[model samples]
Target chain A: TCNASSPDFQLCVRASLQQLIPELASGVPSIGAEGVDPLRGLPPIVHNSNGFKVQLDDVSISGLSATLINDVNVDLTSNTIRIQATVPGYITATGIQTTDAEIMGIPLKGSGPFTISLANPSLAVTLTGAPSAGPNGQTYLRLTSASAAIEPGTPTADIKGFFPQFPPLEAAASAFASVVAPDVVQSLKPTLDKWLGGVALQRAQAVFSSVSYDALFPGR
Target chain B: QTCNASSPDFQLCVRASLQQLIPELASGVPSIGAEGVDPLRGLPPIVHNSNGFKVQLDDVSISGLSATLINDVNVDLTSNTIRIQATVPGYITATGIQTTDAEIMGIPLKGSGPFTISLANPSLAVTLTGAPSAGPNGQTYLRLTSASAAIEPGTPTADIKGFFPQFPPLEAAASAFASVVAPDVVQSLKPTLDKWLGGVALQRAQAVFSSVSYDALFPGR
Candidate 1:
């Protein structure tokens, strides 16, 4: 617990985040947040650019529990919160990628299951908010907007059922994955930002509604 | 066939040649292995930081470069320099997330979103200096030694969306502020554009020039 008006409010917020993040892996059911370790039910990712098309369906990520919070800064004047974290262990995904195109002079056409892993992924999340009166006339922090920059780490892929006639082409596809993985992740930033921000705002609203502003920030 | 360098009106001949090539350059000369210039792709993100404020624009694309009209061309043989002037009736749209943390017109603009800035016939100036170099085929060609470019700021119409979407009044005020500041922003980006566009033009010119010899391009020295 931390007081919003305290001189060391930012530090207190940092400590609170450090303590709460690990528990978020399994979720805090009291707050209605589901387990985030294996964040599931995400929208599919589809990319088409410069004659190249890729579709990844049923995508789910695991291993968020191992994320280490590096820093947290709360700017009271600006009503903003910034968090930096890194997942030390591999964050892995299993999905089906359907592709039909020529990339780097290699004609690839396939539809199959694939596993992609990013080592030590890092992210910076920023939240802007304002204080609003709830239905009960109690003030609570309401998040207005959010943005995030995700750097999916060094990637390795294992794709199967593609280029069955040529093993070398399949190998080439795997090699190419390491090159384009970053851009693919970069392209997904907007979607991920929306999904993550929505969830965070939802959970925060729930918690804030239950807790009193005066109780959280005594003298303020 | 191209203009003859030995022609009495070599400068005018070069100007006519470039005028004829404008359409081909716009639509891309596939036979010469050039990509279309209409929708420029793979532009890197622009990050501007000043006075504790940061504005970042990512996944940017500029369209309607194909509608550009050649205004003037100057070829100086003694100086070995080529200068081109053109007008771009185009617009820039950034689809990727854009973030800005600043205050304008008593309004604090802070958030992330998409933005489009339309141009009113922006002028473009490009200068190039090249030297004769031998190709692999034992033919002499003009290799671009240095290139530079500049764009005059244009009157812009700006539309920014998704920033502070929950607050329509704030968003509207911010959009108005964007219109006021867009031209200055473009001016602030001039140095970066000079370097980046110059490099892009140099590489593309080198690719086209490498495939053809000076004699093949200009003929009759």
Candidate 2:
């Protein structure tokens, strides 16, 4: 009898989610190419997952949060679970602006050191599903695809990174990322779907595995 | 046996599962939007001002083409891998090939020569990975991590006998045209072909998943 507001049920839910939220809180960022590399020689534009830090060879994202469940709903009758949370994230470090010399496979033509940072660009992921067990007794959420919304129209950026002397380069850098952000958002669709589903499924397994429910509720 | 059964089961399961989530799941169906390029539209209908002869081909038309995903969804829970595959039935045909302004090495030549080329229902295998997701509007979108297209066995066959009334009237010119223009068409159209196929492939996929609304799958979206 796990009611929606039952203290024990909520306790179980929180316990289960806390264990899995850390993994969902952050993840490695990857190039948006997915498979085809259209842009051959530029430093790969890495995308950060909601609330997770992403570190690539040349770019790094930080200040994202995956810890807060923020919202939750669990039903025992239908064995359904739904969760919503905000992954406050941002772009932290981009070496695209710091390298002085011509670099390997980077197309920065001394235009200016380019850097980008978002003013707390936020993304929210909503996961809902019933628990299912994999053949190996692993639990999984048959969760639907999820997408993160760009909180506002566009995130601000300082295009001229470490180079205010070249005013033109700064404008260009800002303009470049402005143009690229939406495209990145567009490209993020497939990757997020694949990733979000996997995270929910994997963590759902960890939290809901037949053997783990007892750990959450203890005396259930 | 399980693989074959699983393919259909996967489709049905997705359908049934969504229907249960949202009772308004209207007639669960696969999406193949009427959006597609004419197979022959990829090529120009006629090539004029050639060194020897000008060539013309009839417009291409298609009949009865459909794609059914064949492979089982790779739900590798342990190693954390997921993948999906589908095969499309390709049917394309052109009515006739005729040439005008013909000359055999500067010799004006003419005749009622006609031939046709067609690719009737070749199997086109397509695979997609990444997972499916929905937006605020409930429209489903999927990331196409990887996509590739290939013919099963039979290549496009052209009767290729319409250039001359007799076989040898313009043997040199016709042979040269085939060898020369063939590669040019392919080379010039490679980008166009990739874009068109890749676009339609993605659109077809979007249409397939578009039937599933996020609100249906997840109540109180």
Candidate 3:
């Protein structure tokens, strides 16, 4: 149904607080550099879906068993939490399937035969649509595939080994991969992260791709 | 002995520029920060390397080199060939090896290895340097490692990709990452994508990893 519960509830939460700004400028019509007249405050975004946390304020709202389909930072945050949130299916996902049907083998959100190498990328994502009808009419709950992507960030020291530029490149990529998890919860998790995992099949909006990376190269 | 003239120059140019701007990001600079400051007047006083530029009537002291280093801004005010009055190598005194004099293979200048600095893209040039007092006494050039770095005004996009954040983390992680790399431009790239695959062996890649069934399917398992 189109009611705001489970998945839809997540979408609404995302749409709502998504506009909440830093207490400093929440009330003003501040426009970020991008020209997006931020409806509320600006969004400090992140990428790579690991270390993400999704905290629901009014946990009692849907007192029904909050069975997060996927394990991960589905329902945790600073206010509430889980030092170790559950990871759905598997720790890290890889490989693909046939019939495109639900292959409950393991983590069903990523690529497979996985060799986390960019040349032979192990992580890939796709969302399946499951449309159903309600009393009003035929509504849809298009599963928004919430999966992690491989992203390399700024590196500290680049020692030569695996690849020539691998030192800096790989190091940057790892830093991003590591820290990116928490931001997942800070922005997307609480509501949208879980429910909107596969909400829109549209182009992925990198909600958290603009974090600063000076620490890696502190002196620059 | 390890100075590659072709790339080091460009790398130094970029590195020098980056070192100059490192403070700007952490200082919590607001947008339009460049408003009050006149671009023509040149950048704030630089200690070692210079940024921003100025051109007086006679003294050709500065150029638009710094401005050109900005991302997407590909105007090389001084087409890779700045005619700054040259100074002889400062450390030319103690220059060549004296003790157990060994044959200098091919690399020109000497130092630990050549350090690199890039200004977006693959426009790599090089620099050559010598020890401080290793010259013929009265040194001249202060620009360590003369084999300077350089790159054309328009460098390749791939080259510039080095400066930005290449991945978005979890919800909170994403927020944190953004707070760090502000305008770095490095967005989620391919490498992390592979790591994600390792974490979750989704069905899309089933054929590659092998199998739709038990242990054979999940690589992480």
Candidate 4:
């Protein structure tokens, strides 16, 4: 719980957000919210440019529950909220990727199961919202837009059934993947931003529409 | 003086004649009605939309045509088509109100302002189709009918200035991201570039062709 008029309102907001992580991970089923620890059924990611193409299907992510909320700032005057968080444990994704591409002039083509793990990733998200009436005639915050930046750290990727016949080439590709992981993540930032914004906005609406603003932050 | 169609080494002679004309074409030959190609102006706008991101650039100009090196030239009498291949080491710059709207790397960018993007060195290939037509003096001249062109730009660069002047950090980061994705951005505009380049090439060729008779151009004939 947070008191908007309290002298320590910002600190209370941070504490409340931190406490909600466990509930969010387990899901507030009474409010029809799904668990987020292992968020599933996300849309496929498709990238095609020049002679490079990649498609990742059936993607699912796990380990979000282990993330630590580092800070939260609420600007009542501006109607903005900013959150900073970091994941100490690995955030892992499992999917099937089809790639037909060339990297540094080396031709690569494969369709196989892929696993990507990010160690200690961190992110900052800013949300803008306005007060609106809920179904029960209570005031609630309706998010208008969201923006986020992620610093994906030390990513490791494994693709099974790719270049199995050429052990040396496979090993080389694996090594190259490790070296280029940072840049790879950077290049996919736009796609990630879209996904993050859409998902976060939807989830926030689900919770906020059900709970009144006064209930979450009293004395507003 | 130009190549004679009846010459045994007509292709070689044509190539040589074009090589000599390159400087005149670059600087513009008013006597022959050829307009200056370097610092080309009045280019078409380029628009690209993908996954909620949109970018539009207008008032484009490309310079450094004088640095181009003619690689090969081929003529087909039966098909009435002439193919010219060249390596164009040039700079393409666009000015005016450039617009962009998208979320890039967590940054929500939506703005329209004075902007410019510069691209370097792209390979060019142009094919022209022509037919002989009667001139005023009872002589015949090759009138270029159509031209088709292709461009391959490798690892181009972009600078998006004045979009976020109030936010210097955001401006720099966005510009850097634009540079990183320049290849993809340019590739999306390839179709428009091809059509525009084709039209420009045809206009220049027609200007020269319409000024000279076929017999005068191919002197030995």
Candidate 5:
């Protein structure tokens, strides 16, 4: 097997290649971190406020499901996972502005606070400057901010924190909760396990979209 | 342990204010410590390498994830979960630059070096620029990235000189690679399970969801 023409030689070539490419892959040969062992394990101790539950007139509402909730469950199809809580609540944040019908600009309306995402395990929606006109004369923002969480927290803030908010959200959840298809969820998960099998990323990245009162409540 | 009733007024005030909420509960309302039991397990670790011996090969690095302000999943709710990341593939330098008039009637032309292309998953985030050469116009510019891929790497190569133009010229080169799916898979699972609480709790639960069976759902890209 040690002979050059033996299958063993092919195996050795592969083994060596695996041990050498991370530094050369980007066209620039830099000795970046690429070893069989994850140089750094799961991120350091991360403390984050995962999700937020919204209540409207004392009723605990439901978030969004891949179905009835957003009714538009888009998939990046790239290990991209999403879950949400949808309820009809009035969102009223002080500095928060709004339209005659849209909450924080996102046109969907209903209950108290629809946390479209968690703070810790944050949300990431791909969008641009697109606006829609809601009920009254409200030119709602294409997306609003709901509460939710981000996974794999950190002691110090990360480059991308799963920080949640409103006005940045898109739809109001229709379900109390909904998760991605088992296969989808399975396929889209992150690669934290390989580096730190002992670490848990975080509660799955969540989405909480609510229908709350305009943060800028114009007297009824 | 059953909790007792909290002061109605104070609780109500905290509930209404985002800045006043606590971590894992309401924002701003700092907790005694932290809430929500931390998960137990973690993810598997992965290490991969690829060298060309004297051939200069490819490798990569995943810059941590980044957050997105707007999400557009389906009709907006299409605007659900998001993926965040800011990364640069490992760059392979050219053989070296020859800063003299080395070609085309003594015209000063810069050169490129050893480089390989790679495509780490999530694609394109894996990109490249510049090429090294040993002689004048002998050096080449990456005119344009004409096309790219996700499943495979898109490394580049330029010939070194003072020698005949052959299959693989005589000189030093650079190359890079990308997204080791197996390795990432090898890296993500452990942490996922721990977050689920020994695989016992409801995992990212949600209610009335959408399951479309549309004919035009997926149009060919």
Candidate 6:
């Protein structure tokens, strides 16, 4: 450990944590926690036997499980710690619902597992922290705003009919799934924010708060 | 906290950051602000709005600017306002600037071309504002508030682009174009530039100040 008086102490400490903290990983909670279900209490599948109808929506929304976490970097000039957590993918959505529809005056209907498969639906959130006045007088560490958005242009999906050889089914399924996926994903924001406040922030605080300034830079 | 604005250290840091930002401000091209041509035709004149008559040059980029920020710096954080004024001097060359062609009332005209317009040694004023605040993190910061810039009347060598071939109605035409578009373009650009200046430059400065202690930057006596 380098002492504060050391000329390279700040640089060394900055480097050490940059490598150390990002290495720490933990399981992120999935949806269906604390009585909140992004799937919104709907069963994954709804079936009407007797050759009538069957519907399925397989959407499992969850809190972030960061695949790779960026180590915290302190800007000496700005005196703030910046960290980015890159979640591999964060997307949840529903499936096709059909009730015997006709594609051009031809009546056709049956159950279908037609679904949308997608990945790399990732989101990155930037959190900045700096010193501010807090209770009692010690340096009040505050992390206020967090900007999160789906990583640009990394998402791909395929919507196909569960029933092969049926061009109409494929077409209809594709049309339905396209509308369903985005709708489901859009509703996941508030849930994700809840998880962020509850889960991600706590996890990071556990790591950062553990970093002792005086010990890390002994001569401070 | 109240402190001296004339101190060497305070001035140095502010000047250093401002100078560093000069190049940032210079981005995009030969123009820090985009050259826009506002047709003066449909718009009311500066002094006579109620008459409902248009001063009909349609609109054009009638001024030229080759601008740069001067090194002079002034910082006055009096009361709760932060004003850092710096000098910028440049030459307003002839209006070879790309222009939008227009009509003279009912008469037609070419959009715009290099009209012989030039002015010299123009002094411009640029200012930035920030106020001390308790940042969310347990620190104080001079968070960015706003930014602005202004230039004095570039009394120019008259414009040779005139309706008659005999003697160009240059001076009046140049004056009218400058008068009409100068305030319009400057006001239009102020908010846009402020957004950027606050977002990029001021944020960087805030980072630097918030990172270091007050005394570290100012050596407050």
DockQ (C-alpha based) per candidate is 0.01, 0.00, 0.02, 0.02, 0.00, 0.00
Worst 10 residues of 4 chain B by lDDT: B162-171
**How accurate locally is residue B17 in candidate 4, as Cα lDDT from 0 to 100?**
83
TM-score of every candidate: 0.46, 0.28, 0.17, 0.47, 0.11, 0.25
Ordered from best to worst TM-score, the candidate numbers read 4, 1, 2, 6, 3, 5
Top candidate on TM-score is 4
Per-residue lDDT of candidate 4, residues B1-221 (tens digit): 56778889999888888888877777688888877777666656666677867877667666767667788999876666899898766565545667887655433456776665666767788999998888788888898899999987655767776433444443565566667666876787687668877887888788888887767777654
lDDT of 3 by residue, B1-221 (tens): 12123443543454444435434533323441321111122222211111221111111122122332333112122232222111111111101111111111110111111111122322223223322222244432222222233323122121111112233222223223323332232132122323322222222122221222212111111
Candidate 6 lDDT by residue in tens digits, B96-206? 322323322222223333344444555545565766667676655566566554545344454434321221232234334444344443344344434433444344444
TM-score (C-alpha, index-matched) for candidate 1: 0.46
Clashes of each: 0, 7, 124, 0, 159, 19
Q: Write the residue-wise lDDT of candidate 5 on A1-220 in tens digits.
A: 1234343443443343333334322222132222211122223221112221212121121121111122112222222223321223221111111111221211222233322221222222222122345566543333322222223211111111011222111111122112211221222223222212222122111100111112111211
**Local distance difference test values of all predictions, in order:** 0.71, 0.41, 0.24, 0.74, 0.22, 0.41
State which candidate has the highest lDDT: 4
Between candidates 1 and 6, the lDDT winner:
1
Which has the better DockQ: candidate 1, or candidate 6? Answer: 1
Better of 1 and 2 by DockQ: 1
Model 3: per-residue Cα lDDT over A1-220, one tens digit each: 1132344444433333333323212222232122111121222222333432212221111110111222112131121111111112212212221111111111112111211111111122333333334334533233334443322112121111111122333343334433433332234333433332332233222221121112111121
* Candidate closer to the true structure by lDDT (higher is better), 1 or 4: 4
Of 2 and 4, the candidate ahead on TM-score is 4
lDDT of 4 by residue, A1-220 (tens): 7788888988888887777777878687776577788877577877777786888888888899887989999887777889999999799988888888756533456777878899999988888899988676788888888888888877887765444444443554455555556777677767777777777777777776778777878786
- Recovered fraction of real interface contacts per model: 0.00, 0.00, 0.05, 0.00, 0.00, 0.00
In model 4 chain A, the worst 10-residue window by lDDT is A161-170
Per-residue lDDT for A43-160 in model 1, tens only?
6766677677778788778888888888888665676778998999798988888987665433456788888888998888887878788787777777777777777777777776
Query: Which docking band does candidate 2 fall into?
Result: incorrect
